Amino acid sequence: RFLKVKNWETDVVLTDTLHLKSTLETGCTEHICMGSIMLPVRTKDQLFPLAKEFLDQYYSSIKRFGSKAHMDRLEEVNKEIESTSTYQLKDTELIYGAKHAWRNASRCVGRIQWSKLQVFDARDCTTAHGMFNYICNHVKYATNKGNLRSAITIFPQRTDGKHDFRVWNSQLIRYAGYKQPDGSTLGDPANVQFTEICIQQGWKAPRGRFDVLPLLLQANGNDPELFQIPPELVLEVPIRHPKFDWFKDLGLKWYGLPAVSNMLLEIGGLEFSACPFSGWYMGTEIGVRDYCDNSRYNILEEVAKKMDLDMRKTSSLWKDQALVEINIAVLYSFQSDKVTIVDHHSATESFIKHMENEYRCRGGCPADWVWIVPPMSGSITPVFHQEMLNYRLTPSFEYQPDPWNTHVWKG
Amino acid sequence: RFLKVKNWETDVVLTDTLHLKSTLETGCTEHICMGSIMLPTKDQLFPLAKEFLDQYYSSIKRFGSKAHMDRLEEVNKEIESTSTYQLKDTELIYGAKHAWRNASRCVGRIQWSKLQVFDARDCTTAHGMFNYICNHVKYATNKGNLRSAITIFPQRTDGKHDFRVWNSQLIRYAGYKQPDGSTLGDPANVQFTEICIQQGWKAPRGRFDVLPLLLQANGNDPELFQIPPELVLEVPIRHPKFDWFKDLGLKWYGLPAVSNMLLEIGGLEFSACPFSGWYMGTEIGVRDYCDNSRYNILEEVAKKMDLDMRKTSSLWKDQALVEINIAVLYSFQSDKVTIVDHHSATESFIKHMENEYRCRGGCPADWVWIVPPMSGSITPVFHQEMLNYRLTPSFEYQPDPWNTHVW
Ligand code: HEM
Ligand code: HEM
Ligand SMILES: Nc1cccc(C[C@@H]2CNC[C@@H]2Oc2cccc(Oc3ccccc3)c2)n1
Ligand SMILES: Nc1cccc(C[C@@H]2CNC[C@@H]2Oc2cccc(Oc3ccccc3)c2)n1
Ligand SMILES: C[C@H](O)[C@H](O)[C@H]1CNc2nc(N)[nH]c(=O)c2N1
Ligand SMILES: C[C@H](O)[C@H](O)[C@H]1CNc2nc(N)[nH]c(=O)c2N1
Ligand SMILES: [Zn+2]
């Protein structure tokens, strides 16, 4: 079968065949579209087919499909599964797998970069202190004094599900949030529950507006342990505006390294429950979402007050005006400090070129429009006008339950 | 079978059961989501008629009554006899209001029950259609105090006697390709404008030429009519801060009036059913003015603002976008022509969704269309999960008539 997508701005039409290789389910049916829903131990039996499919994909990619080396590797994995119930990936297969999980990530606008991913193999790690060391090295490598480099660190795979490696933090670097008795929040409201966990575990909270959270790390299914990332490894950018001199006095800053730590990486049926990865920011992630969401820092009012905009009616577009100024400030600040960032125009234009190339070379590019379209100025970016097909390919990054809801406390 | 939707800003969860009624298909499957694609006998008619009357009689608390069974008998008799049937005025009005209620791409549905329905089923000629349409235009415009309205022309019969309005909207501006290589006026309407010329229209060849109506009655060749200018309320565009804005020579019309869709009620098909409401400001200021394939004015505006257009990261496009949209709202409000901003409209839609969940068990909504084309995440609809499904009565797309009509 062939499926067409159309760009309504350019009339360019593309043909997708890659969707035929998708097996996992979307949430949608013939009767209902779930495209805007945020969240819509394996047997030996189910494991060898997943391994075989992955290895066939790997061997095809290196132009060795059906070779002696391909056949011998299938036999070796087969033997290992029946004998031990699982298998180990070769370093080459792990690198290919992690790159392809990023390539397949339909909610990621940054995928033009997918083939440049530094993979750190941490499968020999055994303790939380060992995880802390791997993570510091990742942060220092990825930060590169502001010249950011994409990286992922991969801890040992799930065995029986009772010995999981997990980073409890949702991102490696994030700010604390504190609920006050009067109901107001100090710091980042998204991180209140996690901050409470840290405090309970013994973190002495400074109780400010931008306190970098400690890492909470779980090795081998044991209770997690706290660690403070060395401050010299945490690059931060003070936010100021090119024309508005009062902007600095809002006291805003943000960290340079966006690093997702709560997802699960599936490669050939194996499950890597701790696989922190990082790239660099697109400006709207900070200036639109982190700063201006009602349930996040929520700074729109204070900024619009300072700009002296007419705030009595929504129809003066004061919120829209303040939004653009904050986003200009974020890009200006990062660029001035020589910390890698991309604006939403550049990033979406690059994504369209990536997508077109993927269709030609791969037969498709699964993409989730709801997530790819930026959260401001949607239709003046080329992605708004681009039809997309969303489907699930493996290797993949998946969501997993927060570890505090599932962990068995050993005490 | 029961489905939950969460708002990620407020944590409110609603439960959807209304989707189980849904009959038509979405284009998605278990393996692929088509959420962002723009367009994804006698025997057939009685289940469709039945399903409709059942919901009609339920809505007036008379389900299973003698009037209910009687009407079901009467329509059954008429289909068996004539191969079609005729709606009672009450059913037509109900069907039309519900087609709006079921429109998953429409953010303005809080207004669904306040719709003036003009029954034009007695219409026979294109001059007659012109009369009905002028009357609709005048009524809906109401000298700037806009009222929602639909005019319904006779239903499909054998499909060779189709009523159609060839225009995509009742009021739109012409588009012309020039020797220059550029486009004068609205590039979306270039083809339709050509069809107007080839059928006889004398084009002024300006930037904002109100198009003529091309009306097809009873499957005949369509005919041209100029809408009386004094019935077309237009708004000159100016800015409350920038005195130079007015010299861009921009204007828009006050009445948004979709005329190319098909209304389906109880299996009956109404191929000419122009309807109108009032504008949300972004439709004009973001899409009409700033789409690259539309009036595409961002460059000119940014230049007059003297922004740094050297790099994308100065956000010069975004700054100009906001100002253009401020001018749209200010101009309509100053001239007392009804308009809604995207903040107000999306706030209302969330309230409407809550009413629908509470009173009907759900609300079909297409997130891709509901979230405004600028400032998405500062509107509450961005953070609201929505389930998309197709309920009838409905508005449906249909082929452009020039590709289909046999002259
Ligand atoms: C190189 C620069 C990159 C940029 C500019 C970028 C951009 C983005 C953005 C803007 C999002 C949406 C974030 C949100 O709204 O929460 C995202 C999501 C995502 N990206 Fe990237 N990305 C980059 C690198 C990476 C890397 C290195 C990986 C993994 C190897 C990755 C995998 C993902 C995944 C799995 C998501 C979905 C997250 C979720 O569902 O919460 N990206 N990307
Ligand atoms: C009263 C004020 C109204 C407002 C503010 C409003 C708002 C909107 C907006 C912004 C759109 C998206 C338009 C686009 O991007 O092309 C839309 C679509 C739509 N609306 Fe409304 N609407 C209103 C009245 C109506 C009425 C009276 C009807 C029918 C009786 C209706 C039915 C529809 C339909 C069927 C669509 C989808 C059109 C398509 O798929 O092209 N709306 N509405
Ligand atoms: N520029 C880049 C580079 C790499 C990765 C990203 C992803 C960016 C970088 N910070 C966070 C963001 O993803 C999130 C944000 C918030 C929650 C989250 O997890 C979820 C999401 C939905 C439901 C439940 C949990 C993921 N952005
Ligand atoms: N504020 C209101 C009130 C009622 C209706 C509307 C819908 C508003 C009123 N003008 C325009 C808009 O409909 C369009 C315009 C152009 C294309 C379109 O969708 C397509 C796209 C491609 C092919 C076919 C249809 C829909 N907006
Ligand atoms: C309900 C809705 O799906 C949700 O708010 C989504 C919309 N699109 C998004 N897109 C991105 N990139 N990130 C997000 O957090 C969201 N949130
Ligand atoms: C391809 C994509 O579906 C298309 O550009 C859509 C996106 N969302 C939209 N939303 C509205 N309200 N109107 C539109 O025309 C569109 N266009
Ligand atoms: Zn879908």
- Token readout for A183 is 């109901």
Which chain B residues contact residue A296 at CB under 8 A? none
Q: Distance between CA B112 and CA B105 in Å, rounded?
A: 13
Q: Helices (H), strands (E): how many in chain A? A: 11, 18
Query: Does A395 sit behind a cis peptide bond, omega within 30 degrees of 0 on the bond before it?
Result: yes
Phi, psi of A9 (to 5 degrees): -90, -40
- Token readout for B283 is 């439709």
Residue with tokens 């049937």: B85
Q: How many CB atoms lie within 10 A of CB B204?
A: 12
Q: How many CB atoms lie within 10 A of CB A391?
A: 25
Q: Distance between CA B136 and CA A344 in Å, rounded?
A: 43
β partners of residue B82: none
Residue pair A146/A233 in contact (Cβ under 8 Å)? The answer is: no
β partners of residue B177: B183
Q: Distance between CA B405 and CA A101 in Å, rounded?
A: 50
Residue with tokens 């579209």: A33
Q: Distance between CA A227 and CA A197 in Å, rounded?
A: 13
Residue pair B391/B18 in contact (Cβ under 8 Å)? The answer is: yes
Technique used to solve these coordinates:
X-ray
- Token readout for B281 is 């400001």
Q: Which of B280, B226, B316 is nearest to B107 (CA)?
A: B280
CA distances from A216 to A168, A189, B325 (A): 5, 19, 47
Q: How many CB atoms lie within 10 A of CB B136?
A: 23
Minimal CA separation from A143 to chain B, in Å: 22
* Cα–ligand 2 centroid distance for B102 (angstroms): 11
Q: Which of A217, A210, A232 is nearest to A172 (CA)?
A: A217
Query: For chain B, which domains are there?
Result: 16-121+148-158+262-276+346-370 (3.90.340.10), 122-147+162-233+397-401 (3.90.440.10), 234-256+279-344 (3.90.1230.10)
- Token readout for A211 is 């306190």
Q: Which of A199, A151, A164, A162 is nearest to A179 (CA)?
A: A199
Q: Helices (H), strands (E): how many in chain B? A: 11, 18
Q: Distance between CA A388 and CA A366 in Å, rounded?
A: 7
Q: Is B278 a catalytic residue?
A: yes
Q: Return the DSSP state at A214.
A: P
Provide the residue type at B231 as one letter. L
Provide the residue type at A52 as one letter. K
Of A28, A328, A386, nearest to B315 by CB-CB distance is A328
Q: Distance between CA A248 and CA A242 in Å, rounded?
A: 10
Q: Distance between CA A97 and CA A396 in Å, rounded?
A: 8
- Token readout for B28 is 């998605």
Which chain A residues contact residue B322 at CB under 8 A? 317, 320-321, 324
Q: Distance between CA A79 and CA A408 in Å, rounded?
A: 33
Q: Under an 8 A CB cutoff, do B318 and A376 touch?
A: yes
- Token readout for B304 is 């007059």
Please identify every residue of A annotated as catalytic: 108, 111, 280, 285
Q: Which of A120, A128, A212 is nearest to A166 (CA)?
A: A128
Does ligand 6 have an atom closer than 6 angstroms to the CB of A246?
no
Which of B91, B223, B264, B283 is catalytic? The answer is B283
β partners of residue A232: none
Cα dihedral angle (B139, B144, B147, B149), rounded to 10 degrees? Answer: 50
Q: Distance between CA B154 and CA B157 in Å, rounded?
A: 9
Kind of pairing between the strands at A13-16 and B275-276: unpaired
Q: Distance between CA B311 and CA B316 in Å, rounded?
A: 8
Using only C-alpha atoms, chain B has a radius of gyration, in whole angstroms, of 23
Which helix (H) or strand (E) is B236 found in, with range?
strand B234-236
Kind of pairing between the strands at B234-236 and B223-225: unpaired
Q: Exposed (0-12), middle (13-18) or buried (19+): which is A213, by Cβ within 10 Å?
A: buried
CA distances from A58 to A89, A391, B218, B306 (A): 11, 20, 62, 53
As a residue count, chain B comes to 407
Q: Distance between CA B162 and CA B326 in Å, rounded?
A: 42
Q: Distance between CA B68 and CA B59 in Å, rounded?
A: 12
Q: How many CB atoms lie within 10 A of CB B41?
A: 5
Minimal CA separation from A207 to chain B, in Å: 24
Q: Crossing angle for the helix pair B89-101 and B45-59, nearest 10 degrees?
A: 90
Q: Under an 8 A CB cutoff, do B389 and A33 touch?
A: yes
> Rounded to 5, what percent of chain A is helix, strand, coil?
40, 15, 45
Q: Which of B175, B187, B176, B128 is nearest to B154 (CA)?
A: B128
- Token readout for B67 is 């009037």
Question: Distance from first CA to last CA of chain B, Å, rounded?
Answer: 50
Q: Distance between CA B134 and CA B160 in Å, rounded?
A: 26
Provide the residue type at A239 as one letter. I
Phi, psi of B371 (to 5 degrees): -70, 125
Q: Where are the beta strands (DSSP E) in A60-147?
A: 118-121
Q: Which of A374, A395, A389 is nearest to A33 (CA)?
A: A389
Q: Which of B82, B112, B80 is nearest to B96 (CA)?
A: B112
Q: Distance between CA B219 and CA A31 in Å, rounded?
A: 34
Q: How many CB atoms lie within 10 A of CB B397?
A: 10
Which helix (H) or strand (E) is A54 found in, with range?
helix A44-61
Q: Exposed (0-12), middle (13-18) or buried (19+): which is A20, by Cβ within 10 Å?
A: middle
* Cα–ligand 4 centroid distance for A289 (angstroms): 29
Q: Return the DSSP state at A23.
A: -
Q: Which of B96, B86, B87 is nearest to B273 (CA)?
A: B96
Give the torsion sign (CA, A18, A21, A25, A30): positive
Q: Distance between CA A396 and CA A392 in Å, rounded?
A: 8
- Helix, strand or coil for residue B60? coil
Q: Distance between CA B347 and CA B9 in Å, rounded?
A: 13
Cα B49 → chain centroid: 25
Using only C-alpha atoms, chain A has a radius of gyration, in whole angstroms, of 23
Does ligand 3 have an atom closer than 6 angstroms to the CB of A295?
no
Q: Which residues contact B23 (CB under 8 A, 6 or more apart)?
A: B51, B390, B391, B392
Q: Distance between CA B371 and CA B367 in Å, rounded?
A: 6
- Give the chain B residue nearest A369 (alpha carbons): B36
Q: Which residues contact A388 (CB under 8 A, 6 or more apart)?
A: A5, A355, A367, A368, A369, A372, B36
Q: Is B109 a catalytic residue?
A: yes
- Token readout for A132 is 């802390």
Q: Distance between CA A322 and CA A247 in Å, rounded?
A: 11
Kind of pairing between the strands at B149-152 and B275-276: antiparallel
Q: Distance between CA A314 and CA B127 in Å, rounded?
A: 44
Q: Under an 8 A CB cutoff, do A345 and B19 touch?
A: no
Q: Under an 8 A CB cutoff, do B389 and A30 touch?
A: no
Which chain A residues contact residue B388 at CB under 8 A? 32-33, 35-36
Provide the residue type at A68 as one letter. K
Q: Which of B385, B397, B399, B395 is nearest to B35 (CA)?
A: B385
Q: Crossing angle for the helix pair A44-61 and A68-84, nearest 10 degrees?
A: 160
Q: Distance between CA B149 and CA B139 in Å, rounded?
A: 8
Q: Distance between CA B357 and CA B16 in Å, rounded?
A: 7
Q: Return the DSSP state at B281.
A: H
Q: Which of B370, B371, B373, B367 is nearest to B388 (CA)?
A: B367
Q: Under an 8 A CB cutoff, do B315 and A324 touch?
A: yes
Provide the residue type at B34 as one letter. M
Q: Distance between CA A366 and CA A8 in Å, rounded?
A: 18
Q: Which of A124, A107, A156 is nearest to A271 (CA)?
A: A156
Q: Distance between CA A94 and CA A120 in Å, rounded?
A: 10
Q: Which of B117, B203, B325 is nearest to A377 (CA)?
A: B325
Residue with tokens 């299973």: B64
Q: Which of A298, A282, A265, A289 is nearest to A395 (CA)?
A: A265
Resolution, expressed in angstroms to one decimal: 1.9
Q: Distance between CA A298 and CA A100 in Å, rounded?
A: 36
Residue with tokens 């969460």: B6
Exposure string (b/e) for A224-245, b if CB count within 10 Å is 16 or more?
bbbbebeeeebbbbebbbeebe
- Token readout for B148 is 């929602």
Q: Which of A186, A184, A335, A338 is nearest to A251 (CA)?
A: A186
* Cα–ligand 4 centroid distance for B258 (angstroms): 6
Residue pair B311/B221 in contact (Cβ under 8 Å)? The answer is: no
CA distances from A79 to A43, A60, A82, B375 (A): 15, 22, 5, 56
Q: Which of B112, B47, B117 is nearest to B88 (CA)?
A: B117
Phi, psi of A104 (to 5 degrees): -85, 0
β partners of residue B394: B264
Q: Which residues contact B375 (CB under 8 A, 6 or more apart)?
A: A319, A320, A323, A376, A377, B342
CA distances from B123 to B131, B134, B166, B401 (A): 10, 14, 17, 19
Long-range contacts of B237-243 (CB under 8 A, 24+ apart): B237/B327, B237/B328, B237/B331, B238/B327, B238/B330, B238/B331, B238/B334, B239/B323, B239/B326, B239/B327, B239/B330, B240/B326, B240/B327, B240/B330, B241/B326, B242/B304, B242/B305, B242/B323, B242/B327
Residue pair A111/A201 in contact (Cβ under 8 Å)? The answer is: no
Q: Which residues contact A184 (CB under 8 A, 6 or more apart)?
A: none
- Give the chain A residue nearest B368 (alpha carbons): A370
Which helix (H) or strand (E) is A321 found in, with range?
helix A318-336
- Helix, strand or coil for residue B223? strand
Which chain A residues contact residue B341 at CB under 8 A? 314-315, 317
Q: Which of A280, A263, A341 is nearest to A101 (CA)?
A: A263
Q: Exposed (0-12), middle (13-18) or buried (19+): which is A71, by Cβ within 10 Å?
A: exposed
